[PDB]
């Protein structure tokens, strides 16, 4: 899929660079990547850069992004110990997967938008669960929305997305035929129905807001993440 290094190390105050490649060419002929920081498995990712270069206003100025050819680089200028985290890159593939993630780069340092998920729980294999995400703080009907999951100790995995207008419902390969995403723009909610559950569907499921200007979504453009809801599938 996407290719990024497994690890990078730095001393405090140095400039860190993490490079990702492998994204599919977009409709405008260019390439687009997002960078998602996760400090611990018990916590939601945070977008540090999206659409190659855009930095959310609350993110420290020391994070910046660039693109060269089909590659993207996250630069941390003046790295701090608090920046230790796994950084996942995201983009789209060439065809059927609008959202794909790299395996994550672990950084070692030497020396009003809200998304609120519900519906998780324990289920037996073969059963079903219905996850719901309640959004506030933005014009929900304008934006694509996504679900992304993380199995215990594993990386981010795209589950499903839906465009602002209810269309373009696409699914990750591992859940094909078992997942249905829907949204209710009047209630500012996005729903994920998961059927025929499997043990390896266990993980934390995060709702995600997309920032694409056209109401669609992709792996380069997630700008907000929920707190996650736990799905535990076991017999």
């Amino acid at each position: 899929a996407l290719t990024q290094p497994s690890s990078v190390s730095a001393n405090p105050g140095e400039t860190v660079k993490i490079t990702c490649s492998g994204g599919g060419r977009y409709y405008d002929g260019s390439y687009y990547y997002g960078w998602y920081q996760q400090k611990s498995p018990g916590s939601a990712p945070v977008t540090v850069i999206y659409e190659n270069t855009k930095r959310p206003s609350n993110i420290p100025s020391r994070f910046s992004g660039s693109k060269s050819g089909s590659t993207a680089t996250l630069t941390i200028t003046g790295v701090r110990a608090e920046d230790e985290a796994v950084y996942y890159c995201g983009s789209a593939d060439d065809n059927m997967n609008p959202t794909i993630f790299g395996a994550g780069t672990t950084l070692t340092v030497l020396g009003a938008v809200t998304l609120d998920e519900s519906g998780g729980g324990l289920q037996t294999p073969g059963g079903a669960l219905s996850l719901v995400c309640k959004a506030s703080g933005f014009t929900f009907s304008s934006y694509g929305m996504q679900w992304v999951r993380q199995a215990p100790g594993k990386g981010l995995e795209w589950v499903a997305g839906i465009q602002n207008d209810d269309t373009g419902t696409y699914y990750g390969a591992a859940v094909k035929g078992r997942a249905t995403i829907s949204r209710d723009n009047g209630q500012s909610t996005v729903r994920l129905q998961l059927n025929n559950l499997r043990a390896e569907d266990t993980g934390t499921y995060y709702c995600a807001k997309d920032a694409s200007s056209d109401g669609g979504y992709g792996g380069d453009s997630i700008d907000a993440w929920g707190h996650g809801t736990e799905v535990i599938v076991s017999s």
């Binding site: 599919g24 977009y26 409709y27 405008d28 260019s30 687009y32 659409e51 983009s91 789209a92 065809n95 059927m96 609008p98 959202t99 694509g144 997305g161 465009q163 269309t167 373009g168 696409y170 997309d210 694409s212 200007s213 056209d214 109401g215 669609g216 979504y217 992709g218 792996g219 380069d220 453009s221």
Partner: peptide
């Protein structure tokens, strides 16, 4: 930018 999902919708 045209988003990845809009591209897939247009091709589909």
């Amino acid at each position: 930018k045209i988003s990845a999902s809009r591209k897939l919708q247009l091709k589909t």
